Structure 1
Amino acid sequence: QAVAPVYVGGFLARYDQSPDEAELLLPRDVVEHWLALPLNINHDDTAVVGHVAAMQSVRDGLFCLGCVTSPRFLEIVRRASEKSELVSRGPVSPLQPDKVVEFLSGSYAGLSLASRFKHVALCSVGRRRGTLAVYGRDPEWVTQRFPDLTAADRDGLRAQWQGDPFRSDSYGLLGNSVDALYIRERLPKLRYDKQLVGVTERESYVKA
């Protein structure tokens, strides 16, 4: 079923990266000290789509695994996915087509941690670099998309992930999508994030 659960994984912060703003800084020690969070869209608290199923502080940073479960949001996404050229082109060679997963990959390619832990936002592109969002139906498959993770890192994550809270609508998502078009260097940042975490379009649903 298309409207079945969707897992999203990726880094909320890369220690090896120097944030441009003194606000984005997120040291390891301060993170390992703090280390279920709601998962939303673009930080709008009226757009909760699921929850964070796991968080693990690793070598290169803070890795996060989330699960999109809102029936209202998955249905809106399903409908929109049927009317999208990007999605009709499908994924790369081996990967089987998954409209909902592909629409989510194209739309919210970034991950953003809110704590200006309050919650993780799915967004057009994260403000911190290396925050690529990877979507999939199977949590194991998702975590295996990141080379930086070790079997030990994955075991810590597996133990964790192992009414409808979305109070928004298609109109809200649409207005948000137009904003996405004016975020400068969006794609370059995404490509940079992709390169940094070693994820490739030739082995995932990443559109960037």
Structure 2
Amino acid sequence: GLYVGGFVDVVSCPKLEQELYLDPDQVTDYLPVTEPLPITIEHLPETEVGWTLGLFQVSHGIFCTGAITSPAFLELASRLADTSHVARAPVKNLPKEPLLEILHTWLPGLSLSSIHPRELSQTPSGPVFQHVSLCALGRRRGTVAVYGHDAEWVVSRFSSVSKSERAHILQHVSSCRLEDLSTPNFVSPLETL
């Protein structure tokens, strides 16, 4: 069970013909998001690995904290981190905690999916946000995502998050028992072979 944290990029209609990144202010009226959104990979169906634990406007942007909870994904990633020369190639040699490093390097981007801003300027009918994705490519305003085993340690790593803002981010992790989150739908794309 891991935590992830970072500032996000806001993307409308991701990876499709109409993809467009949004100014955070285009969606800050719809923050904070206190209810769990799925965390997926590269905006792909059926790659749920976790659930968000809060999305907040802070001084420097929109900060996301999440929980990576998928047993299939954690087991696969961790096995890769211990035995795959390919996974480890772009990481510093001999890391302590290779799983954290592997994730930090291969999935540095947090991408928050939203409806098109033509809906957001007016009054939206339904949910403004759909999910947060861990992304290999496309990070812009977002920071490099931090992965760790305890939520306070993760939020602690960003210097552009104040002690009060951090004290406005840890209440909500500790407000949701990880055990009570739904089981995410990630399946290893290995034994599909």
- Give CA-to-partner distance per residue, 1:128-164, whole Å, 9 cap, x none: 3333211111111111111111111011101110174
Residue matched to 2:187: 168
Q: Which runs of 5+ in 2 are unaligned?
A: 11-17, 116-128, 175-181
Residue matched to 1:191: none
| Structure 1 position 107, deviation (Å) | 1.6
- Determine if the alignment matches structure 1 residue 9 to structure 2 residue 5: yes
Residue matched to 1:121: 133
TM-score, structure 1 as length reference:
0.67
Distance 2:23 2:67 in 1: 24
Correspondence for 1:147 among 139, 159, 162: 159
- Determine if the alignment matches structure 1 residue 90 to structure 2 residue 102: no
Cα distance 1:88–1:63, how it changes in 2: closer, same or farther (>3 A)? Answer: closer
> Does the residue aligned with 1:45 lie in a helix, a strand or coil?
coil
> Does the residue aligned with 2:159 lie in a helix, a strand or coil?
coil
TM-score, structure 2 as length reference:
0.72
> Does the residue aligned with 1:43 lie in a helix, a strand or coil?
coil
Correspondence for 2:168 among 151, 156, 168: 156
Instruction: Answer yes or no: is the 8 Å Cα contact 1:112–1:128 preserved in 2.
Output: no
Instruction: Answer yes or no: is the 8 Å Cα contact 2:73–2:186 preserved in 1.
Output: no
Structure 2 counterpart of 1:109, one-letter code = P
Structure 2 counterpart of 1:138, one-letter code = D
| Structure 1 position 29, deviation (Å) | 6.3
Distance 2:74 2:2 in 1: 9
- Determine if the alignment matches structure 1 residue 49 to structure 2 residue 52: no
Runs (4+) of structure 1 exceeding 4 A deviation are none
Q: Which runs of 5+ in 1 are unaligned?
A: 15-20, 92-96, 173-208
> Does the residue aligned with 1:74 lie in a helix, a strand or coil?
helix
- Point out the structure with the larger helix share: 1
- Give CA-to-partner distance per residue, 1:176-199, whole Å, 9 cap, x none: xxxxxxxxxxxxxxxxxxxxxxxx
Bigger relative contact order, structure 1 or 2, given CA contacts below 8 A and separation 6+?
A: 2
Structure 2 counterpart of 1:24, one-letter code = Y
Structure 1 counterpart of 2:112, one-letter code = L
Distance 1:122 1:6 in 2: 13
Residue matched to 1:75: 75
Structure 2 counterpart of 1:113, one-letter code = L
- Give CA-to-partner distance per residue, 1:61-88, whole Å, 9 cap, x none: 1011111011011111122112234268
Cα distance 1:90–1:45, how it changes in 2: closer, same or farther (>3 A)? Answer: same
Instruction: Answer yes or no: is the 8 Å Cα contact 1:54–1:65 preserved in 2.
Output: yes
Aligned residues: 157
